[PDB]
Amino acid sequence: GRWAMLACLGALVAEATTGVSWVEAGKVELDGASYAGLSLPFSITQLIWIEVILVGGAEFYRNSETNPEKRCYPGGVFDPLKLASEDEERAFRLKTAEIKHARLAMVSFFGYGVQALSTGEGALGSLAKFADGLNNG
Amino acid sequence: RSGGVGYRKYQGDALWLPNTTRPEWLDGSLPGD
Amino acid sequence: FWYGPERPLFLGAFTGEPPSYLTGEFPGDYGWDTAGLSADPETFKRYRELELIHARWAMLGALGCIFPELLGSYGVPFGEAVWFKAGAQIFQEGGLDYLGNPNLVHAQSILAILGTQVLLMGAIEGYRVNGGPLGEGLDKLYPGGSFDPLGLADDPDTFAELKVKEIKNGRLAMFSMFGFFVQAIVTGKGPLQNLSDHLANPGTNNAFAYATKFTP
Amino acid sequence: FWYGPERPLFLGAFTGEPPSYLTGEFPGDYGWDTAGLSADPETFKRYRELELIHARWAMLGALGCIFPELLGSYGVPFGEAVWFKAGAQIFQEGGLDYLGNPNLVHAQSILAILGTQVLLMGAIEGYRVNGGPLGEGLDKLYPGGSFDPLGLADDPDTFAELKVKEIKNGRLAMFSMFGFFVQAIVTGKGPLQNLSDHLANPGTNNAFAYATKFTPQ
Amino acid sequence: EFYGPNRAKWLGPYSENATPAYLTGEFPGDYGWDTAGLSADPETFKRYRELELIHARWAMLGALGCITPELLAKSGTQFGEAVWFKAGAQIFSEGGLDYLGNPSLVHAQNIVATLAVQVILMGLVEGYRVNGGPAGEGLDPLYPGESFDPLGLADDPDTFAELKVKEIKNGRLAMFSMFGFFVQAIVTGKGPIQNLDDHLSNPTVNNAFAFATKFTPS
Amino acid sequence: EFYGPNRAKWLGPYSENATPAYLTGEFPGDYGWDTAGLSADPETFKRYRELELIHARWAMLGALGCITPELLAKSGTQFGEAVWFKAGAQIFSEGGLDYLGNPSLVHAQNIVATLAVQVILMGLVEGYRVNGGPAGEGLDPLYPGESFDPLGLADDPDTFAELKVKEIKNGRLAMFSMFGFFVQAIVTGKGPIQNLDDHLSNPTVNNAFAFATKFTPS
Ligand code: CHL
Ligand code: CHL
Ligand code: CHL
Ligand code: CHL
Ligand code: CHL
Ligand SMILES: CC1=C[C@H](O)CC(C)(C)[C@H]1/C=C/C(C)=C/C=C/C(C)=C/C=C/C=C(C)/C=C/C=C(C)/C=C/C1=C(C)C[C@H](O)CC1(C)C
Ligand SMILES: CC1=C[C@H](O)CC(C)(C)[C@H]1/C=C/C(C)=C/C=C/C(C)=C/C=C/C=C(C)/C=C/C=C(C)/C=C/C1=C(C)C[C@H](O)CC1(C)C
């Protein structure tokens, strides 16, 4: 869930500025590393070694906790605001808000990819195609 | 002060059908249940 | 007001008519069983179910036929705007279009539309008998449950007269809905055309305008 | 510092005498009822019910006037970025494109807009009086419940000053909208458009230039 | 019915829970609604009870008074400017005015003199209404009675109490509708029948949204 | 007279029963008239006595200040602007706002500096009117004392009570006449003596019905 809703929002904000859909985000930075229209010095070979080393250790440290509840909701440093750390009823409806935003995210991202397999169009470009004929016809 | 109008309390747990029962291995301790 | 013994009946100011088995604790009881169809009270229970399902299907049936000439004459380009020629929209090459827009549903053939249609109402009309995932042990006519979210069915005296407002809105709906079949076969155009026709000439656009239409 | 007799009042250090029925108990108590409207202890409740709903409906309003015209200056092609011209966008053939984008909301029937608003606002202001599936028997102004998910209103001590910050931000926003209606009738321009013209030349683009605007004959 | 706790309300069942303690259902028209709360002073509320009925009876006179030129000008009878916000301006014509169609009628010509008749007639009646005189001296200022009710409709108290509520509901429609009549004439610029002459033909466009851009400045 | 229960009232002989009982005649201007019932609460009525008196004391200054640059303009001395409701506009002229026609006089130029000293010192007095300051601390917020009475006139408390009624009556004239001035100036567009001289010219056409159709809708 947490990867999905972090990606569904990223599939739109990246498009809403650049105009490059998330489907075709590959080739357009295979030639030049850009972000918000600003260039970046990394080769794509450099990007993979930076990616595997950095997000490796996060996925190793996430596998270091032994409590099956604390593997889900660790808190601690990851809750600086201390929202769901106390007041267990108030923390509970926070948790129901994350899973509903998790379940809605995964379906929405499985929404993007299937209609990107048929149309070949991205998140918002395949939205405008539906509103293209719906408005005129 | 309150008044129950415009809605219904339903006295229930809001399952994924309007009237079925809960499977045994699922208990309401988790938030997503 | 529409219950009890001292209620107004179908003859209005008359009181010697009803066939003495009914008492008037059920919505719309005027005693109008002059031909005596339901003197068996067990038989009389089966009609009260059978009238209400006739009442509810004809209320949405009437609303399901006013709009395509209401919208179509007022700027909505349908595929075809008349309710008793509406079934021919599937016959065309482009199929039928919801609100005249082809990138909608865009159904083409008949081998799949009624294939799924008889199965959906094969279950939920059978769920009305018993079972059904919305409620198992409930009333067969007015169950409540997740069919009444608004909670308007709670004040039972007020609930009993909404039932009166459910049948009176429905008895004139069924009486109207039979009137839709008659004037369509005689004249041949949709009803709001016939509204525009009668307000054009009130005297002679009547039923006598085509009383010689079925002459042998 | 905010409650009791050692609170600030509307005249400050030279305040002298406030009205008698303002004891330093409720938020926004600066003792400014010089015309004495609310000497009744029952009616004074009804205005505190009515000042705050005006206050909350005006704080969210100010980001509906400033905020579309502000985004229009930074590269968003709105239909009408000026807020008092925003209603006329539904009568053009492009329709009410949200953020100037055609594949968003795209309203066409103006009578269908408020045709569903009344069914919602009727059911949603009637919940504020009583009932409602959110909070059944609760406070008429500060229910918490699930209107306060984060829990910034837990202890009763800190909760008093957040009520003070709600109404001082609130009265400040209501001051700007007796403003916002005047500066649109007078100038015919957006509010930040008047702010952009005042920073260019303040001594000439002030309100004394428009002092003869309503001249008779 | 219409009195006590089981009476009609303002928001239906939504205002049933919150209702003021001084609004209980004693007087006609207590739908239980004082969202400003300004009537908790009861003798002040007594004055607004007076001001409501007085503003309703003078409403119901002018209620039909603003339509009777309009539907009768088109029904055949000749009128000169049968539009109520301009039908008072007809006295500037040198032919004066008609009462229906003729100068052989009342036939007002000069307006300076007709106010001198006008002010002195309500100089007494409004003083008679508040104090008394030839039409009674000491009755109810809101329901005096026998000097203006000879016909006996105000006799049975179970009927008369319903006739109280029938009086102001016909007036609360009247106070509301002429608040329309002012605004529907300022915005469009024609009589309300002639507004309805636009709304019966084309209901969709000819309404108040067609003139929504009228007052915006530049 | 003008005190006691036997005082004379707002309808004279048609008002001896409509008077609310708390209206006695112990205040200057108590004429038995609370017909809307706005001030049944006496402490609330205490604040409206201040709102009547301060509106009276600003209107009496406001009446004469619209007069003296208009009649004396006809005394042979030009005043730059002779009309009162555009008399503020003469500060933007070539010589600015001269006090009278001499440029060796006051000769106001900068509109911002006029408002600058104005709004800072008016806040002191209108704040010193609340608490106190130089002119006393614990006096009456309506009638302080001999600090504002340099001529010894605030003695003889029966004559001083007579001068209180003559203080508000001359105010209620001035509040009503300032109420006249703004209306006829947004109809006709002339000063009230310039309106008077033309009613002095031809009284028949120059009644209030001269522009009754001026604000008609279309
Ligand atoms: C006191 C006078 C009074 C009378 C006589 C009636 C009588 C009637 N009411 Mg009643 N009412 C009366 C007062 C009141 N009613 C009602 C409320 C109601 C309701 C809600 C209903 C009735 C209905 C009826 C009808 C019941 C019998 C029937 O269905 O006939 C039907 C048979 C006929 C009318 C015979 C038709 C005669 C026609 C001339 C034949 C035409 C010949 C053809 C043209 C030839 C065919 C040619 C072919 C070959 C092509 C009947 C018309 C019912 C009704 O009208 O349903 C349709 C109904 O639903 N009444 C109220 C308010 C409480 C009243 C107030 O006092
Ligand atoms: C109540 C008995 C009654 C019957 C049975 C008829 C039947 C007839 N009318 Mg007549 N009418 C009746 C009363 C009245 N009619 C009229 C005015 C007219 C006009 C203006 C016309 C007719 C015509 C007709 C004929 C049908 C059309 C046709 O082509 O015939 C051939 C078909 C048949 C003979 C089939 C017979 C009908 C079938 C058996 C079903 C009927 C069942 C029962 C009558 C019950 C039906 C419900 C009842 C309760 C109304 C037929 C002679 C039309 C005509 O003459 O055209 C040729 C025509 O133009 N009628 C008035 C008004 C004064 C009536 C007053 O009650
Ligand atoms: C000791 C000095 C002091 C003074 C003089 C004031 C005075 C005021 N404070 Mg206070 N305060 C002072 C100290 C303090 N105040 C506050 C906190 C507050 C708050 C939160 C508020 C006030 C408000 C007020 C106002 C109360 C009455 C009013 O609304 O006047 C209004 C009327 C005038 C000022 C006079 C007329 C207006 C204008 C200047 C006339 C100019 C003429 C036009 C140019 C003519 C236009 C032409 C034609 C077309 C008409 C008034 C401006 C209230 C306020 O802001 O009201 C808007 C208010 O909400 N004060 C604090 C912090 C503790 C203070 C600290 O010492
Ligand atoms: C409730 C708040 C509200 C207000 C104050 C306005 C007012 C406005 N609308 Mg809007 N609308 C509002 C909500 C809504 N409008 C619309 C639909 C439209 C359309 C289609 C149009 C407008 C237009 C306008 C503008 C008219 C120009 C003007 O007034 O001249 C200048 C004068 C002022 C701005 C003074 C305004 C102050 C106001 C009169 C006093 C505030 C108190 C109000 C009486 C309270 C509002 C109603 C109450 C009873 C709740 C102006 C911004 C027109 C437009 O934008 O074209 C340029 C237009 O075409 N509105 C809908 C959907 C039904 C709304 C939802 O409630
Ligand atoms: C018995 C005769 C008598 C009459 C008729 C009056 C009349 C009045 N006295 Mg009284 N008095 C009378 C005797 C006496 N008074 C007084 C001493 C006083 C004083 C000191 C005062 C009064 C005042 C009043 C007024 C209080 C009520 C009001 O506000 O009017 C409201 C109703 C009207 C004015 C009539 C309605 C006007 C008309 C219909 C409008 C014109 C329409 C236009 C053509 C267009 C309208 C615009 C449209 C388009 C929207 C009232 C006009 C007060 C006052 O001066 O008020 C002005 C006041 O201060 N009287 C004395 C000496 C003791 C009297 C002796 O008998
Ligand atoms: C206290 C006291 C004291 C003393 O003693 C006495 C006295 C003086 C009387 C008093 C005072 C009072 C006052 C001051 C008052 C004021 C108020 C206000 C101003 C409000 C606002 C208020 C305001 C308000 C509500 C407002 C609101 C607004 C809104 C919603 C808006 C909306 C919108 C938007 C978003 C924009 C777009 O485009 C559209 C629209 C839709 C339009
Ligand atoms: C209750 C309450 C409560 C809460 O708490 C608060 C609040 C909200 C404040 C409140 C409310 C209120 C209201 C709504 C009010 C309204 C009123 C009105 C509208 C009146 C009218 C009123 C109106 C009116 C009088 C009117 C009248 C009219 C008239 C006579 C007319 C006359 C005429 C005529 C014959 C015709 C000719 O050709 C001319 C003329 C001359 C034109």
The secondary structure of F34-70 as a DSSP string is: -TT-TT-SHHHHHHHHHHHHHHHHHHHHHHHHTTTTT
Residue C177 near residue C55 (C-beta atoms within 8 A): no
In this structure, are strands A34-35 and A38-39 parallel, antiparallel, or unpaired? antiparallel
The closest of F208, F50, F72 to F142, measured between CA atoms, is F50
Backbone angles phi, psi at A37, to 5 degrees: 75, 5
Residue D52 near residue D28 (C-beta atoms within 8 A): no
Query: Residue E195 burial (CB < 10 Å; 0-12/13-18/19+)?
Result: buried
As a whole number of angstroms, the longest Cα–Cα distance in chain F is 63
CA angle F137, F139, F142 (to 5 degrees): 125
Q: How many whole angstroms separate alpha carbon C51 and alpha carbon C170?
A: 9
What DSSP designation does B7 have?
S
What is the DSSP track for chain A?
-HHHHHHHTHHHHHHHHH---STTTTHHHHS--EETTEE----HHHHHHHHHHHHHHHHHHGGG---TTTTT---GGG-SS-STTS-HHHHHHHHHHHHHHHHHHHHHHHHHHHHHHHS---TTHHHHHHHHHHHH-
Q: How many whole angstroms separate alpha carbon D109 and alpha carbon D113?
A: 7
Q: How many whole angstroms separate alpha carbon C50 and alpha carbon C37?
A: 14
Residue D49 near residue D35 (C-beta atoms within 8 A): no
Residue at token pair 């070539």: F94
* Tokens standing for residue F217: 């809708």
Which residues, in sequence order, are bridge partners of residue E133?
E136
Residue D30 near residue D14 (C-beta atoms within 8 A): no
Structural element, H or E, at residue E159? helix E157-187
B near D: at least 3 beta-carbon pairs less than 8 Å apart = yes
CA atoms within 13 A on the CB side of D77: 3
3-state secondary structure of F136: strand
Annotated binding site of F for chlorophyll a: 31-33, 39, 48, 52, 55, 57, 90, 100, 143, 145, 152-154, 166-167, 169-170, 172, 184, 188, 195, 199, 207-208
- CA nearest ligand 6 atom 33, residue: D61
Q: By what method was this entry solved?
A: cryo-EM
The closest of E181, E149, E193 to E167, measured between CA atoms, is E149
The closest of D12, D57, D68, D63 to D171, measured between CA atoms, is D57
Which residues, in sequence order, are bridge partners of residue F196?
none
Q: How many whole angstroms separate alpha carbon D88 and alpha carbon D72?
A: 17
Annotated binding site of C for chlorophyll b: 10, 54, 56-57, 87-88, 105, 108-109, 117, 125, 128, 134-135, 214
Q: SS3 helix, strand, coil % of chain B, rounded to 5?
A: 0, 0, 100
A115 annotated binding-site participant: yes
Backbone angles phi, psi at C21, to 5 degrees: -95, -35
Cβ-based neighbours of E192, under 8 Å, separated by 6 or more: E66, E67, E70, E180, E181, E184, E185
Q: Which residues line ligand 4 (CB under 6 A)?
A: D 84-88, 90, 110, 113-114, 181, 184-185; E 209, 212-213, 215-216
Q: How many whole angstroms separate alpha carbon C30 and alpha carbon C8?
A: 7
The closest of C66, C69, C70 to C80, measured between CA atoms, is C69
Contact state of F127 with D11 under an 8 Å Cβ cutoff: yes
Alpha-helical segments (H) within F20-156: 42-65, 111-128
E178 lines ligand 7 (CB under 6 A): yes
A134 contacts in C (CB within 8 Å)? 101, 103-104
Q: How many whole angstroms separate alpha carbon D64 and alpha carbon C163?
A: 46
Residue D55 Cα distances to D9, D175, E180, F99, F158, angstroms = 20, 10, 29, 45, 51
Of residues D42, D87, D130, nearest to E212 (C-beta): D87
Resolution, expressed in angstroms to one decimal:
3.4
Task: Ligand 5, residue F31: give the atom nearest the CA.
Answer: 20
Q: How far is the CA of F129 from the centre of ligand 3 (A)?
A: 14
The closest of C82, C64, C68, C89 to C177, measured between CA atoms, is C64
Judged by its nearest atom, the ligand closest to the C-alpha of residue C1 is: 1
Q: What is the dihedral of CA F5, F7, F11, F17, to 10 degrees?
A: 10
Dihedral of alpha carbons E147, E150, E154, E155, sign: positive
* Tokens standing for residue F213: 């159709």
Residue D79 near residue D69 (C-beta atoms within 8 A): no
Residue C38 Cα distances to A16, C172, E28, F164, angstroms = 70, 21, 48, 92
As a whole number of angstroms, the longest Cα–Cα distance in chain E is 62
- SS3 string, chain C, reads CCCCCCCCECCECCCCCCCCCCCCCCCCCCCCCCCCCCCCHHHHHHHHHHHHHHHHHHHHHHHHHHHHHHHHCCCCCCCCCCHHHHHHHCCCCCCCCHHHCCCCCCCCCCCCHHHHHHHHHHHHHHHCCCCCCCCCCCCCCCCCHHHCCCCCCCCHHHHHHHHHHHHHHHHHHHHHHHHHHHHHHHCCCCHHHHHHHHHHCCCCCCHHHHCCCCCC
* Tokens standing for residue E38: 């300004």
Quick one: closest CA in D to E213, which residue?
D88
CB pairs under 8 A between B and D: 20
* Residue C102 contacts A, CB cutoff 8 Å: yes
The closest of D85, D83, D86, D89 to D176, measured between CA atoms, is D83
- SS3 string, chain D, reads CCCCCCCCCCCHHHCCCCCCCCCCCCCCCCCCCCCCCCCCCCHHHHHHHHHHHHHHHHHCCHHHHHHHHHHHHCCCCCCCCCHHHCHHHHHCCCCECHHHCCCCCCECCCCCHHHHHHHHHHHHHHHHHCCCCCCCCCCCCCCCCCCCCCCCCCCCCHHHHHHHHHHHHHHHHHHHHHHHHHHHHHHCCCHHHHHHHHHHCCCCCCHHHHCCCCCCC
Q: How many whole angstroms separate alpha carbon E175 and alpha carbon E79?
A: 27
Residue C173 near residue C55 (C-beta atoms within 8 A): yes
Residue at token pair 């088995």: C21
Q: How far is the CA of D165 from the centre of ligand 6 (A)?
A: 18
Quick one: closest CA in D to F115, which residue?
D208
Q: How many whole angstroms separate alpha carbon C94 and alpha carbon C106?
A: 8
3-state secondary structure of F188: coil
Counting other chains too, the contacts that C73-77 makes at CB distance below 8 Å and 24 or more residues apart are C73/C192, C74/E204, C76/C100
Backbone angles phi, psi at C120, to 5 degrees: -65, -55
Residue type, E127: G
Of residues C133, C134, C151, nearest to B8 (C-beta): C151
Residue E66 near residue E178 (C-beta atoms within 8 A): yes
The closest of D55, D44, D108, D97 to D72, measured between CA atoms, is D97
Residue at token pair 């985000």: A25
Quick one: closest CA in D to A87, which residue?
D151
As a whole number of angstroms, the longest Cα–Cα distance in chain A is 58
Quick one: closest CA in F to E130, which residue?
F18
* Tokens standing for residue C174: 């069924």
**Which one of F50, F117, F119 would you pick to mutate in the ligand 3 pocket, going by the greatest count of ligand atoms within 8 A of its CB?**
F119
Cβ-based neighbours of E174, under 8 Å, separated by 6 or more: E56, E59, E60, E63
Shortest alpha-carbon distance between residue E13 and chain F (Å): 32
- CA nearest ligand 7 atom 12, residue: E52
**Which one of D53, D57, D78, D84 would you pick to mutate in the ligand 4 pocket, going by the greatest count of ligand atoms within 8 A of its CB?**
D84
Residue window 1-33, chain B: list those with CB within 8 Å of chain E: 1-3, 5-6
Q: F10-42 as b/e, with b when 16 or more CB fall inside 10 Å?
A: ebeebbeebbeeebebeebbbbbebbebebbbe
The closest of F19, F21, F27, F25 to F5, measured between CA atoms, is F25
Cβ-based neighbours of C20, under 8 Å, separated by 6 or more: none
Q: How many whole angstroms separate alpha carbon D177 and alpha carbon D197?
A: 19
E127 lines ligand 7 (CB under 6 A): no
The closest of F189, F182, F180, F193 to F210, measured between CA atoms, is F189
B5 contacts in C (CB within 8 Å)? 151
Of residues E14, E17, E40, nearest to D43 (C-beta): E40
Q: How many whole angstroms separate alpha carbon A112 and alpha carbon A127?
A: 10
Q: How many whole angstroms separate alpha carbon E8 and alpha carbon E4?
A: 9
Residue D56 near residue D168 (C-beta atoms within 8 A): no
Shortest alpha-carbon distance between residue A112 and chain D (Å): 16
Dihedral of alpha carbons C197, C199, C203, C208, sign: positive
What DSSP designation does F97 have?
B
Backbone angles phi, psi at F136, to 5 degrees: 110, 160
The closest of A15, A22, A5 to A115, measured between CA atoms, is A22
Taking the alpha carbons at both ends of chain D, their separation in whole angstroms is 54
3-state secondary structure of F183: helix
* Tokens standing for residue C187: 């004249």
